[PDB]
Design a protein around this motif. Structure first.
Motif, PDB file in Angstrom:
ATOM      1  N   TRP A  20       1.910   9.530 -11.712  1.00  0.00           N
ATOM      2  CA  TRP A  20       1.106   8.311 -11.979  1.00  0.00           C
ATOM      3  C   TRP A  20       0.031   8.616 -13.003  1.00  0.00           C
ATOM      4  CZ3 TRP A  20      -3.582   6.537  -8.693  1.00  0.00           C
ATOM      5  CH2 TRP A  20      -4.127   5.374  -9.231  1.00  0.00           C
ATOM      6  N   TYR A  48       5.065   3.009 -12.314  1.00  0.00           N
ATOM      7  CA  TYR A  48       4.291   3.938 -13.148  1.00  0.00           C
ATOM      8  C   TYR A  48       4.646   3.750 -14.631  1.00  0.00           C
ATOM      9  CZ  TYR A  48       3.221   6.355  -8.738  1.00  0.00           C
ATOM     10  OH  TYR A  48       2.833   6.635  -7.459  1.00  0.00           O
ATOM     11  N   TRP A  79       8.736  -1.154  -5.721  1.00  0.00           N
ATOM     12  CA  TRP A  79       7.468  -1.829  -5.986  1.00  0.00           C
ATOM     13  C   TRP A  79       7.407  -3.119  -5.153  1.00  0.00           C
ATOM     14  CZ3 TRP A  79       2.893  -0.670  -6.530  1.00  0.00           C
ATOM     15  CH2 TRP A  79       1.953  -1.683  -6.819  1.00  0.00           C
ATOM     16  N   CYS A  80       6.220  -3.614  -4.858  1.00  0.00           N
ATOM     17  CA  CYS A  80       5.877  -4.730  -4.024  1.00  0.00           C
ATOM     18  C   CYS A  80       6.593  -6.019  -4.397  1.00  0.00           C
ATOM     19  CB  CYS A  80       4.352  -4.959  -4.034  1.00  0.00           C
ATOM     20  SG  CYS A  80       3.428  -3.486  -3.505  1.00  0.00           S
ATOM     21  N   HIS A 110       6.926   1.419  -1.462  1.00  0.00           N
ATOM     22  CA  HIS A 110       5.713   1.924  -2.104  1.00  0.00           C
ATOM     23  C   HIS A 110       4.471   1.498  -1.325  1.00  0.00           C
ATOM     24  CE1 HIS A 110       4.146   3.182  -6.348  1.00  0.00           C
ATOM     25  NE2 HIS A 110       3.282   3.540  -5.397  1.00  0.00           N
ATOM     26  N   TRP A 111       4.436   0.236  -0.894  1.00  0.00           N
ATOM     27  CA  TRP A 111       3.337  -0.387  -0.159  1.00  0.00           C
ATOM     28  C   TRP A 111       3.935  -1.368   0.846  1.00  0.00           C
ATOM     29  CZ3 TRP A 111      -1.977   0.707  -0.917  1.00  0.00           C
ATOM     30  CH2 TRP A 111      -2.263   1.486  -2.049  1.00  0.00           C
ATOM     31  N   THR A 113       2.920  -4.225   1.617  1.00  0.00           N
ATOM     32  CA  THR A 113       2.726  -5.578   1.164  1.00  0.00           C
ATOM     33  C   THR A 113       3.750  -6.044   0.126  1.00  0.00           C
ATOM     34  OG1 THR A 113       1.238  -4.623  -0.439  1.00  0.00           O
ATOM     35  CG2 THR A 113       0.223  -5.479   1.556  1.00  0.00           C
ATOM     36  N   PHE A 115       5.042  -8.869  -2.559  1.00  0.00           N
ATOM     37  CA  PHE A 115       4.472  -9.776  -3.531  1.00  0.00           C
ATOM     38  C   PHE A 115       5.566 -10.661  -4.127  1.00  0.00           C
ATOM     39  CE2 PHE A 115       1.125  -6.414  -5.087  1.00  0.00           C
ATOM     40  CZ  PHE A 115       0.457  -6.456  -3.880  1.00  0.00           C
ATOM     41  N   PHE A 122       1.457  -7.541 -10.232  1.00  0.00           N
ATOM     42  CA  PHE A 122       0.397  -8.106  -9.411  1.00  0.00           C
ATOM     43  C   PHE A 122       0.230  -9.592  -9.743  1.00  0.00           C
ATOM     44  CE2 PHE A 122      -0.644  -3.565  -9.628  1.00  0.00           C
ATOM     45  CZ  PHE A 122      -1.013  -3.252  -8.334  1.00  0.00           C
ATOM     46  N   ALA A 299      -7.042   2.425  -3.683  1.00  0.00           N
ATOM     47  CA  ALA A 299      -6.775   1.160  -3.020  1.00  0.00           C
ATOM     48  C   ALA A 299      -7.691   0.130  -3.689  1.00  0.00           C
ATOM     49  CB  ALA A 299      -6.997   1.221  -1.526  1.00  0.00           C
ATOM     50  N   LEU A 300      -7.054  -0.821  -4.335  1.00  0.00           N
ATOM     51  CA  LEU A 300      -7.677  -2.004  -4.899  1.00  0.00           C
ATOM     52  C   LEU A 300      -7.320  -3.164  -3.973  1.00  0.00           C
ATOM     53  CD1 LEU A 300      -7.275  -1.503  -8.763  1.00  0.00           C
ATOM     54  CD2 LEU A 300      -9.141  -0.870  -7.259  1.00  0.00           C
ATOM     55  N   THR A 304      -8.223  -8.282  -0.058  1.00  0.00           N
ATOM     56  CA  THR A 304      -7.053  -9.165  -0.037  1.00  0.00           C
ATOM     57  C   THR A 304      -6.878  -9.764   1.355  1.00  0.00           C
ATOM     58  OG1 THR A 304      -4.683  -9.425  -0.532  1.00  0.00           O
ATOM     59  CG2 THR A 304      -5.305  -7.409   0.503  1.00  0.00           C
ATOM     60  N   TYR A 309      -1.981  -5.913   4.610  1.00  0.00           N
ATOM     61  CA  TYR A 309      -2.937  -4.938   4.056  1.00  0.00           C
ATOM     62  C   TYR A 309      -3.040  -3.749   5.010  1.00  0.00           C
ATOM     63  CZ  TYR A 309      -7.288  -2.928   2.317  1.00  0.00           C
ATOM     64  OH  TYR A 309      -8.255  -2.082   1.833  1.00  0.00           O
ATOM     65  N   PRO A 310      -2.825  -2.495   4.619  1.00  0.00           N
ATOM     66  CA  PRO A 310      -2.770  -1.462   5.642  1.00  0.00           C
ATOM     67  C   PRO A 310      -4.105  -0.852   6.050  1.00  0.00           C
ATOM     68  CG  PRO A 310      -1.932  -0.639   3.522  1.00  0.00           C
ATOM     69  CD  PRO A 310      -2.505  -1.998   3.267  1.00  0.00           C
TER      70      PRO A 310
HETATM   71  O1  LIG Z   1       0.603   2.551  -6.293  1.00  0.00           O
HETATM   72  C1  LIG Z   1       0.399   3.704  -6.746  1.00  0.00           C
HETATM   73  O2  LIG Z   1       1.169   4.650  -6.477  1.00  0.00           O
HETATM   74  C2  LIG Z   1      -0.934   3.986  -7.374  1.00  0.00           C
HETATM   75  C3  LIG Z   1      -1.530   2.693  -7.861  1.00  0.00           C
HETATM   76  N1  LIG Z   1      -2.475   2.299  -7.073  1.00  0.00           N
HETATM   77  N2  LIG Z   1      -3.085   1.120  -7.438  1.00  0.00           N
HETATM   78  C4  LIG Z   1      -4.146   0.763  -6.487  1.00  0.00           C
HETATM   79  C5  LIG Z   1      -3.402  -0.216  -5.540  1.00  0.00           C
HETATM   80  N3  LIG Z   1      -4.004  -0.877  -4.591  1.00  0.00           N
HETATM   81  C6  LIG Z   1      -3.102  -1.697  -3.879  1.00  0.00           C
HETATM   82  C7  LIG Z   1      -3.395  -2.538  -2.808  1.00  0.00           C
HETATM   83  C8  LIG Z   1      -2.380  -3.261  -2.241  1.00  0.00           C
HETATM   84  C9  LIG Z   1      -2.638  -4.178  -1.081  1.00  0.00           C
HETATM   85  F1  LIG Z   1      -2.255  -3.584   0.041  1.00  0.00           F
HETATM   86  F2  LIG Z   1      -3.878  -4.599  -0.925  1.00  0.00           F
HETATM   87  F3  LIG Z   1      -2.044  -5.350  -1.195  1.00  0.00           F
HETATM   88  C10 LIG Z   1      -1.072  -3.202  -2.673  1.00  0.00           C
HETATM   89  C11 LIG Z   1      -0.752  -2.389  -3.723  1.00  0.00           C
HETATM   90  C12 LIG Z   1      -1.781  -1.639  -4.317  1.00  0.00           C
HETATM   91  S1  LIG Z   1      -1.686  -0.552  -5.625  1.00  0.00           S
HETATM   92  C13 LIG Z   1      -2.804   0.350  -8.530  1.00  0.00           C
HETATM   93  O3  LIG Z   1      -3.364  -0.719  -8.845  1.00  0.00           O
HETATM   94  C14 LIG Z   1      -1.724   0.807  -9.376  1.00  0.00           C
HETATM   95  C15 LIG Z   1      -1.362   0.070 -10.502  1.00  0.00           C
HETATM   96  C16 LIG Z   1      -0.344   0.519 -11.316  1.00  0.00           C
HETATM   97  C17 LIG Z   1       0.314   1.710 -10.993  1.00  0.00           C
HETATM   98  C18 LIG Z   1      -0.045   2.437  -9.891  1.00  0.00           C
HETATM   99  C19 LIG Z   1      -1.076   2.004  -9.041  1.00  0.00           C
END
Ligand SMILES: O=C(O)Cc1nn(Cc2nc3cc(C(F)(F)F)ccc3s2)c(=O)c2ccccc12
Ligand SMILES: NC(=O)c1ccc[n+]([C@@H]2O[C@H](COP(=O)([O-])OP(=O)(O)OC[C@H]3O[C@@H](n4cnc5c(N)ncnc54)[C@H](OP(=O)(O)O)[C@@H]3O)[C@@H](O)[C@H]2O)c1
Length: 312
Positions: A20, A48, A79-80, A110-111, A113, A115, A122, A299-300, A304, A309-310
């Motif tokens: 990444w 990535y 991806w989400c 990956h997550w 959540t 989308f 996003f 974690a962004l 949300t 959301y974990p």
């Molecule tokens: O993903 C990677 O490996 C690294 C990674 N992290 N993040 C921070 C994130 N914060 C999140 C929060 C949620 C949420 F759960 F809140 F919805 C869902 C998904 C994400 S990604 C990113 O924004 C991201 C963007 C492009 C490529 C890699 C990443």
């Protein structure tokens, strides 16, 4: 030992290379250097946006007979925006095409959540909320299980899943394959003792991401805690005549984790691999664990409303 046994019968190298943020124009050479130096595990993801370039490096070193495909452990992630049952295989196949492989050793959700599907990673509504998909993780999991049965991937797992979310997978009606791996953020400021004990007790291998604290994450702030510059960690490193990064990598290895430090810097790629010639003491380990601050780097979307959301 260099590899850990997964619940699918395969062995996974406990040291891998993260990709990444590795620029597209630099990552091919980074991965070639990583393989020359001895890495056998590469951590990838569609999101990535550099899988093509990673795959170029893998292909050249296979070609050069520096490595055989069976010795490589290649990981990617769904991806989400692709949690929908009908989109999962397509996502995997795109990753496979870019990496120029005919299977993945491990494919992760990956997550947790989901989308809205679309070109956007996003997708947001007019107010800036992420638009969710109405698919739940258990049907996504069924779709990941199909990929095993189709031969596209040798193992499946999850990432950024909390204790309750792992438990839901484990308790899925008709569960066919257990997750092999949960890949989560983990380092001395975020030690995750409970989650790791829970996963390990279920035979789920944990991978520690951002083990150096991801100092290059785009949202970092100068003010932020710095693992690499923590004098306490500095001290332990010096005691063992190692660098602070080497201690930060060795630390999850001795907790029976897999760890995946990222670098595009050839000297650091080499340095980061030289972690099999020293041992932290039990006390060093407990001391490192004592630095937990529950400080999460990656974690962004923290505000949300997403139901999955974990990190509440
Ligand atoms: O993903 C990677 O490996 C690294 C990674 N992290 N993040 C921070 C994130 N914060 C999140 C929060 C949620 C949420 F759960 F809140 F919805 C869902 C998904 C994400 S990604 C990113 O924004 C991201 C963007 C492009 C490529 C890699 C990443
Ligand atoms: N599952 C997911 O959601 C998720 C989330 C985050 C990360 N991950 C994976 O985990 C990997 C690692 O995490 P990360 O990229 O967030 O960060 P990280 O590996 O903790 O740290 C990467 C930063 O450390 C620097 N660095 C590397 N080795 C160093 C050394 N020996 N000395 C000093 N600095 C060093 C790198 O610089 P240079 O590259 O310039 O050398 C880069 O700026 C990712 O790349 C990705 O593969 C997965």
């Amino acid at each position: 030992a260099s590899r850990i046994l997964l619940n699918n019968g395969a062995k996974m190298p406990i040291l891998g290379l993260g990709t990444w943020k590795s620029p597209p124009g630099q990552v091919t050479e980074a991965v070639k250097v990583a393989i020359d130096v001895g890495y056998r595990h590469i951590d990838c993801a569609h999101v990535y946006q550099n899988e093509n370039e990673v795959g170029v490096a893998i292909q050249e070193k296979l070609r050069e007979q520096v490595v055989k495909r069976e010795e490589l452990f290649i990981v990617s992630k769904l991806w989400c925006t692709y949690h929908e049952k009908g989109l999962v295989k397509g996502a995997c196949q795109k990753t496979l095409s870019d990496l120029k492989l005919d299977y993945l050793d491990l494919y992760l959700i990956h997550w947790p959540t989901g989308f809205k599907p679309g070109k956007e990673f996003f997708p947001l509504d007019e107010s800036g909320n992420v638009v969710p998909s109405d698919t739940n993780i258990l049907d996504t999991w069924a779709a990941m299980e199909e990929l095993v049965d189709e031969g596209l991937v040798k193992a499946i797992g999850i990432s950024n899943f909390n204790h309750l979310q792992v438990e839901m997978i484990l308790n899925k009606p008709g569960l066919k394959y257990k997750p092999a791996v949960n890949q989560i953020e983990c380092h001395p400021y975020l030690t995750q003792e409970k989650l790791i004990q829970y996963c390990q007790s279920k035979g789920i291998v944990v991978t520690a991401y951002s083990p150096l604290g991801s100092p290059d994450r785009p949202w970092a702030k100068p003010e932020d805690p710095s693992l690499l510059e923590d004098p306490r960690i500095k001290a332990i490193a010096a005691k063992h005549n190692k660098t602070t990064a080497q201690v930060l990598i060795r630390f999850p290895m001795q907790r029976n984790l897999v760890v995946i430090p990222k670098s595009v810097t050839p000297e650091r790629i080499a340095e980061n691999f030289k972690v099999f010639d020293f041992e932290l003491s039990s006390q060093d380990m407990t001391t490192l664990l004592s630095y937990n601050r529950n400080w999460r780097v990656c974690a962004l979307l923290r505000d949300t409303s997403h139901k999955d959301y974990p990190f509440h």
